[PDB]
Ligand binder design. Structure first.
Ligand SMILES: Nc1ncnc2c1ncn2[C@@H]1O[C@H](COP(=O)(O)OP(=O)(O)O)[C@@H](O)[C@H]1O
Ligand SMILES: Nc1ncnc2c1ncn2[C@@H]1O[C@H](COP(=O)(O)OP(=O)(O)O)[C@@H](O)[C@H]1O
Ligand SMILES: Nc1ncnc2c1ncn2[C@@H]1O[C@H](COP(=O)(O)OP(=O)(O)O)[C@@H](O)[C@H]1O
Lengths: 442, 418, 28, 443, 436, 111
């Protein structure tokens, strides 16, 4: 695929005793935060408790979202991980509490046990009886294997799936009874008289042998929000894709909660909770915090993980400044993980891993100068310079990045601090805060 | 050899348990004490009725919404069932408002103003605005210049129903968007094509997550027809309301014609297919289960709603596989009838309390129902377990092989303290 | 004993037959 | 085993028969006078005589107000409707907030109706329509009547139908050999499934097979229903459930909240009163709980002073954690608990006091045994000292990281070293604030 | 009919007034406030005469001094068949209607049109129904035998009445009502033959009953506007009805009044907490009162020299001087000890609470010291404390127990200022720890 | 034939219901085409079917340029969403242009 910011992180890099390795699974350093995240990972994997708030706090460029993707990659498949930013709650068709309720309900997975029957064989005869206008459909299907033969009865969905991807009395099909899927595997009869309106070159498969009908147990995971949206109105399955779920009523949610508990009581389903990750949580109003404080106390509540990079700043919707941008009620019911700044060896290891992920070969002195500029400036700038220096070295037709390539990349592309310095000596050229600018050069 | 089995309360059992706890206004200590001692006996009778099976306190029935209707009901070679559902709320309207505001008469100008606003001063009229119609036909590509007058003076639902995809001329200003070009190719396209699969995300998501075998979780509480407006002394009001509520075009559109009637109309009467009324416009439900708001009682919930019955259903399979003869003991006869109908659902060979030597001679009978000499029994089971030794001693007395007793107990109830 | 199959009624309806050698289409 | 979330160790108020609160009962420790006041409120709600009685639970953070609200809800039972609500939920983009408040007010009222139902049911034996004379006449249907023959145990009945019922019958997609169920109150038809009198193993449509129904075909049965007044209002405002076209198309339109008029609520009240007067229905008034009432602005408060004076209003319980704060929507009005003085005069305030070291220690004890964890005595003393030093909630949540850290060393018992390791790994508000004040770039 | 538990104004059945419009000291649930009750009686006679239109009356005073009580007395003294609309000031800030449109709808809900019409109906007890059908059911013949307590008859029926009798299944011994012109048949019930139950009708079978209708102008506006049906009167989606249909309804109502087919029944609009409107609403209200089809507007406020909403200045009563120039003002006054004790005794009589004399004196003293509403709230929570000890009469100890358990304004304020570090202030600061 | 589409065209073709006979589809075809909140679920299924047919050799992905001019008009919430959305796998290159010097960010008072 394509290379992203956290493409090198696959897991959390922990032992069996929840102890971090210095270099494992794309993560280097940050031992205490990784151990605390492993504790939160085991807390999610137990599935015993609900509604715990975790806050990840630190300065920028420290490894907050890196820790979040490490938790998500170590969480495994079939466990929901909902990642939202702070600004997605504000909608013109949904209230803030409704959007937060849907974000809470997307993170609880319902794993349903289903009994299905599979039928594979050769088609002998298809009879389809339709009305004159073509609305009512019924018919019979005659399917065979080596040992058995059975005439079945079809309904409207079966004829609709049979007319699509047309089967022609000698094809081998596989029928799933619970998912309603018709799958054509090939053709075995090799009919001599073919009225070729088509360019079919269908596969020569063998006729299957043995039992025609076979039972099978399947499992599939669905979300609580998806059951609510399906049960809300007549065409809610479309609204799972168009997002036309406008303020689902509370009665639907109470009945869905009771029915999910009932399905747990028969052993048909089970509840698999997950992680909701809210990045940049300071971009939320005070009403959202007041809703979260009481939405964390429900039976169906995930583990909420929040990331903040902000100090004592103004809480939105109010006129006072609070630590982390969050009110003290939300900070009362949260446990805080603190992440710390980096040394130079960690920056060097980060740059080496990010160079290995982009398949870009670096020299030693280029690595030291990139380490020095990632220490003086920020780390993300020195990570961004690598692909530019690779293209510069590819212009000269050699597949290794030298000091001259990264020096040219540093000259051509600017930092933040050099941009502040260049703007502050040339304030007349740029438009100020009062709208004044000198455009004429003399 | 005494074995005790514990099972947790179900959700419905806990619901009527909490209802019975809150009904007598917090006197559970005396309830438990004088229940252990054995008025208050009628109070604890409901408690053991709930602890046995929830159908004794309230029998489960058909789950449907509340019908907010006044209809034609019976106060008790065919019968007529005619639709007669109405609303209890009546909106009463005087005749004067109808006759002088909605109906035309000689002293009002409803029809004159309607003609003036809708035909004479309509700007899509080709008798006065031919240039606008010609401009619009070059814009749109409509073969007829009276199409815009027809569209502008018909309702929207009628416009949806009789819409026909007629041909339009190429030399016009209307186009085909790339989205429509992508849509039109994959209308009848088969599987395993690249365009067809890139345009069929929703059906693949439907068939991957097994959505035609899911169950309905929500049904509404109250269902109510529209509010009935009455006008005393007017047949015109009744005809207008019946025409609006039961419009034949939209009612035919949301239904279909029977097949034999289509055969009689096409062949025996010579009506072409293009002259048939348009039908089959109702959206398909998600499942078969999502088509109605009525849920029938099922014999899978009946087992699970009692923890004792569920544990006994799990326990009976091993004794069936080991081929014993099991004795089940009771205290009432309502639970005797309930277990009799459960056993006839499971089709086990059972007899109900000339039967003694029939029980000893025949080994095919599996479950004996008894209420508080049977030497052929191997396992005896106390459903309504009471620890009075006077009854238990004689119950084990009427019971060469190994004899095992079983007691079904519920955690966190009167029986747990018992 | 073996239970009888459900009655099949197709009156006034077209038919499409698909066999090994030949396909029919009966219309009205 | 089971799941717990910040509650569910609370089972009730734990009062005696005289209303005296025992010290450690019902999962409650302390708060004796507040529990007694809430018990008197519970008896007032059970008396079923008063309307529009409002109390306010006033106290600091982490003092037991939401615990008292769920204790009142558990004391009243599942029969009495309880409507929990946060003050941020009233701000809807679909309808004005006044209508949301009145909707919750009507939702906090119960009704138990004994309704009779006329039922036709059985297995479909014949299905024969008779044709109209002129099908293309414009007015009228294609068919005139449909004859349906239903059979059951000890019975067989022949039904002649209007077209409107048969449209619903064919919308349910019935066939010959199907067990159906027809409701005569609304014209609804439920198709139960295939009959078991024929073969089963020859289908491909995952169907369920039901036996022949018992009793006669025509029945009258009694069903006990539990509805709210909001359900009646919503069902009458957006009508579905008839076979007429407007209710038929009301199921397909996307639902939207509307401003329900006073006339509809008066007519619904008249129908409910006529039901009660005939000995059919029974009224169960309930409780509306609004947590974080300081998030309301002055308009919702000013509407509360009018909505409390209705003769059908429920008992509304409010909760606040505010000292002498300005009301939202105002600039200069400063009021106790963030609630304006025109509403405070209509409230009865219940104080809620903080805790001591022993109460914190035993709260940690019950939260430990509910979460299925085993703690040493010295670790319990350290946790109580943390709870007094920082917060009760912080000592409450630190139990499960301690349990994970104890399990990861192949142990069951929680010791002091696990609590110290969880102290080091996880911080609280005060330590994080002290790191924030002494930091380089806004940490 | 009209289900109701107990309300705060449930003891007020009207204004207690003589034939010379003089207030009794206690009558119809109202004590004290003699001048305010006299002014409200003059306003009531002004409404009942109906010859003047669009006059605004402001009721202003201190809080908890009988203003909503005066409005309830006026509303109960008007009785039925006269429109009374009660809105709050926050009910017009809608998301689908503008403020002036909502005010116009509230104004037009308070004017009624009275129409009298006669319709002929048949009501009686069914004796015997014979219906004969053919093989195909094309033609049906029938007879119906029906009776009252004074006469019996037999009727030959047609096809559509046979179809309307088969639908809504009528057996013998049912009491039914038949409307011939509309074909509507309603089952009143079953008669007294046990073998719902109502009596057999008496008198003539064929009767003409005159029914008096009263339809508001808002209803005719919604019906005449073709964009929405009558169902918007129940669902609430009218959506900014145009002005032109309001002129047609006004001209048609004037024509019906001149011809003699209808009469205008004006009513009262009551706006409570009128200070919560905007300056645009006050400017609209200033000109909506100069119409011939305008009701009498009663406005209630308790503010004094506060900020008018939408502006940045302060005005008396929260209202601008143009609106106050168009109004006459009724002033309510604070109560005495005797009036407080009479109000408490009336409230206790309405809640079925038996009180001792000393409990009544303690409640009167704590009502004078704190508030009238606080004592009225304690008067019903002391009954549960009394019934917990299994007695009927509420004594002094129950009142003291209720006073100790439930706080008032001043004690809660004192506890907040004495413990301000445990609560959340305006700056968002709190101390939740106990030590340090 | 080689047919070139963007991923947004696939999203808006998959989101709307296809050619159907129900009254909702043909009712909405005659109405105003209102924009709607396309969910992350639909974009995920489109991404995985696109990757599946890219791995077969049938398809090829061509990333492009999104150019935003006068980025000082953007609010801080849109900047936060840009911070989130630049972390995607399928994201293009994005070019921003600005002419201001030291200016308060819109949506804030002191930055
Ligand atoms: N410990 C680490 N392991 C791997 N990558 C890291 C680590 N720390 C930082 N990074 C890289 O640095 C960048 C900044 O990470 P981020 O989560 O944005 O920091 P912050 O929490 O300060 O926002 C990411 O692109 C990530 O790939
Ligand atoms: N009296 C009490 N007994 C037992 N647990 C309590 C008590 N008071 C509070 N708690 C616990 O403390 C936590 C905070 O209480 P809560 O009532 O939710 O906050 P607040 O007091 O701010 O409303 C809850 O999880 C609750 O279980
Ligand atoms: N003169 C009176 N006679 C009888 N009851 C009264 C009188 N004045 C006030 N009340 C009662 O006092 C209670 C509070 O007074 P209220 O009218 O709400 O105050 P306000 O005048 O501020 O609206 C009401 O329940 C009302 O019935």
């Amino acid at each position: 695929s394509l290379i992203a910011a956290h493409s090198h992180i696959t897991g959390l890099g922990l032992d069996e005793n929840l102890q971090p390795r210095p270099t494992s699974e794309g993560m280097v350093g940050q031992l205490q935060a990784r151990r605390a995240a492993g504790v939160i990972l085991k807390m999610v994997q137990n599935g015993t408790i609900a509604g715990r708030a975790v806050l990840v706090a630190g300065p920028p460029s420290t490894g907050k979202t890196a820790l979040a993707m490490g938790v998500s990659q170590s969480l495994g498949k079939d466990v929901p991980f909902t990642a939202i930013a702070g600004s997605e709650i504000f909608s013109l068709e949904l209230s803030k509490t409704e959007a937060l309720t849907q974000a809470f309900r997307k993170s609880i997975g319902i794993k349903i046990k289903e009994e299905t029957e599979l039928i594979e064989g050769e088609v002998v005869e298809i009879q389809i009886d339709r009305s004159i206008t073509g609305g009512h459909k019924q018919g019979k299907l005659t399917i065979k294997t080596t040992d058995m033969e059975t005439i079945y009865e079809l309904g409207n969905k079966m004829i609709d799936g049979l007319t699509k991807e047309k089967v022609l009395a000698g094809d081998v099909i596989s029928i799933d009874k619970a998912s309603g899927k018709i799958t054509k595997l090939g053709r075995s009869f090799a009919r001599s008289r073919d009225y070729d309106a088509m360019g079919a070159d269908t596969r020569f498969v063998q006729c299957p042998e043995g039992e025609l009908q076979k039972r099978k147990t399947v499992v599939h995971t669905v979300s609580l929000h998806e059951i609510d949206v399906i049960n809300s109105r007549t065409q809610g399955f479309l609204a799972l894709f168009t997002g036309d779920t406008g303020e689902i009523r509370s009665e639907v949610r109470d009945q869905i909660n009771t029915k999910v508990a009932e399905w747990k009581e028969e052993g048909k389903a089970e509840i698999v909770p997950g992680v909701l990750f809210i990045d940049e949580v300071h971009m939320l109003d005070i009403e959202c915090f007041s809703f979260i404080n009481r939405a964390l106390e429900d039976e169906f509540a995930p583990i909420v993980m929040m990331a903040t990079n902000r100090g004592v700043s103004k809480t939105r919707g109010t006129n006072y400044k609070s630590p982390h941008g969050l009110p003290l009620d939300l900070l009362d019911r949260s446990i805080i993980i603190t992440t710390k700044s980096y040394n130079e060896q960690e920056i060097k290891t980060i740059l080496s891993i990010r160079a290995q992920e982009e398949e870009v070969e670096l020299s030693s002195d280029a690595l030291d100068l990139l380490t020095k500029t990632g220490v003086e400036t920020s780390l993300r700038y020195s990570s961004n310079l690598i692909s530019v220096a690779q293209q510069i070295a590819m212009k000269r037709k050699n597949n290794t990045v030298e000091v001259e390539d990264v020096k040219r990349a540093y000259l051509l592309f600017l930092d933040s601090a050099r941009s502040v310095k260049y703007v502050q000596e040339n304030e007349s050229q740029y438009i100020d805060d009062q709208g004044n600018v000198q455009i004429s050069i003399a | 050899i005494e074995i005790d089995v514990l099972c947790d309360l179900t959700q419905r059992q806990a619901k009527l348990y909490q209802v019975l706890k809150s009904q007598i206004s917090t006197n559970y200590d005396a309830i438990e004490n004088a229940a252990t001692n054995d008025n208050l006996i009628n109070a604890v009778m409901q408690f053991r009725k709930v602890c046995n099976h929830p159908d004794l306190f309230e029998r489960a029935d058909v789950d449907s919404p509340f019908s907010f209707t006044t209809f034609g009901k019976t106060t008790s070679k065919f019968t007529d069932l005619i639709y007669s559902s109405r609303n209890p709320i009546k909106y009463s309207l005087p005749r004067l408002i109808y006759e002088d505001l909605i109906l035309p008469n000689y002293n009002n100008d409803v029809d004159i103003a309607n003609k003036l606003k809708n035909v004479k001063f309509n700007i899509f009229n080709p008798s006065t605005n031919y240039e606008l119609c010609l401009f619009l036909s070059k814009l749109t590509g409509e073969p007829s210049l009276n199409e815009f007058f027809r569209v502008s003076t018909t309702p929207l639902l009628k416009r949806v129903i009789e819409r026909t995809n007629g041909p339009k001329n190429t030399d016009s200003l209307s186009f085909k968007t790339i989205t429509q070009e992508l849509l039109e190719v994959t209308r009848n396209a088969p599987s395993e094509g690249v365009m067809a699969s890139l345009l069929n995300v929703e059906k693949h998501a439907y068939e991957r997550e097994y959505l035609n075998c899911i169950q309905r979780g929500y049904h509404p509480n109250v269902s109510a027809p529209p509010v009935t407006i009455e006008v005393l002394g007017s047949s015109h009001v009744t005809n207008s309301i019946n025409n609006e509520l039961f419009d034949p075009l939209i009612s035919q559109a949301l239904s279909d014609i029977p097949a034999i009637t289509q055969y009689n109309m096409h062949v025996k009467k010579g009506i072409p297919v293009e002259d048939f009324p348009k039908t089959g416009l109702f959206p398909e439900p998600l499942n078969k289960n999502f088509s109605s708001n009525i849920s029938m009682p099922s014999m899978d919930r009946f087992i699970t709603e009692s923890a004792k019955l569920r544990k006994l259903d799990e326990l009976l399979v091993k004794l069936k596989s080991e081929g014993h003869r099991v004795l089940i003991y009771f205290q009432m006869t309502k639970m005797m009838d309930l277990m009799e109908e459960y056993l006839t659902y499971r089709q086990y060979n059972h007899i109900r309390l000339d039967l003694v030597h029939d029980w000893q001679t025949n080994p095919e009978i599996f479950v004996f129902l008894l209420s508080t000499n049977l030497t052929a029994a191997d396992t005896v089971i106390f459903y309504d377990s009471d620890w009075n030794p006077t009854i238990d001693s004689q119950a084990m007395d009427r019971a060469t092989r190994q004899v095992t007793v079983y007691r079904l107990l519920v955690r966190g109830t009167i029986e747990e303290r018992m | 004993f073996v239970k009888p199959r459900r009655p099949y009624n197709s009156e006034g309806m077209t038919r499409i037959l698909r066999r090994y050698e030949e396909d029919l289409f009966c219309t009205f | 085993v089971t799941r717990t979330a910040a509650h569910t160790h609370i089972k009730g108020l734990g009062l005696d028969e005289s209303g005296v609160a025992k010290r450690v009962e019902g999962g409650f420790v302390g708060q004796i006078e507040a529990r007694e006041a809430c018990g008197v409120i519970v008896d007032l709600i059970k008396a079923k005589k008063m309307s529009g009685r409002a109390i306010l639970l006033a106290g600091g953070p982490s003092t037991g107000k939401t615990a008292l609200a769920l204790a009142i809800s558990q004391e009243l039972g599942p029969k009495v409707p309880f409507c929990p609500l946060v003050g941020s939920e009233l701000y809807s983009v679909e309808v004005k907030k006044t209508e949301t408040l009145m909707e919750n007010f009507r939702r906090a009222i119960g009704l138990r109706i004994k309704e009779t139902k006329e039922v036709y049911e059985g297995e479909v034996t014949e299905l024969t329509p008779e044709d109209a004379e002129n099908p293309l006449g414009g007015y009228g249907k294609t068919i005139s009547h449909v004859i349906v023959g239903l059979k059951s145990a000890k019975g067989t009945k022949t039904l002649r139908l209007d077209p409107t019922i048969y449209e619903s019958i064919q919308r349910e997609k019935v066939s010959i050999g199907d067990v159906i169920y027809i409701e005569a109150n609304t014209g609804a038809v439920k198709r139960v499934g295939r009959s078991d009198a024929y073969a089963t193993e020859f289908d491909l449509e995952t169907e369920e097979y039901v036996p022949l129904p018992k009793g006669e075909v025509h029945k009258k049965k009694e069903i006990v229903q539990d509805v709210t007044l909001h359900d009646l209002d919503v069902a009458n405002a957006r009508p579905q459930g008839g076979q007429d076209v407007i209710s038929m198309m009301g199921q397909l339109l996307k639902p939207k909240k509307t401003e329900i008029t006073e006339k509809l609520r008066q007519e619904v009240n008249k129908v409910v009163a006529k039901y009660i007067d005939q000995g059919v229905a029974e009224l169960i008034p309930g409780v509306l709980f609004i947590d974080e009432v300081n998030m309301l602005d002055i308009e919702i408060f000013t509407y509360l002073n009018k909505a409390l004076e209705s003769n059908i209003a429920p008992v509304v319980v409010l909760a606040s954690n505010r000292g002498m704060t300005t009301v939202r929507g105002t600039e200069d009005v400063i009021s106790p608990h963030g609630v304006p003085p025109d509403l405070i005069d209509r409230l009865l305030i219940v104080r809620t006091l903080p805790y001591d070291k022993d109460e914190i220690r035993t709260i940690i004890e019950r939260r430990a045994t509910v979460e299925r964890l085993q703690v040493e005595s010295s670790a319990l003393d350290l946790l109580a000292t943390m709870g007094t030093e920082t917060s009760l909630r912080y000592a409450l949540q630190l139990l499960a990281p301690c349990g994970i850290l104890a399990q990861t060393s192949n142990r069951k018992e929680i010791v002091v070293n696990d609590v110290n390791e969880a102290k080091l790994l996880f911080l609280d508000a005060k330590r994080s604030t002290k790191i924030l004040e002494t930091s380089a770039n806004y940490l």
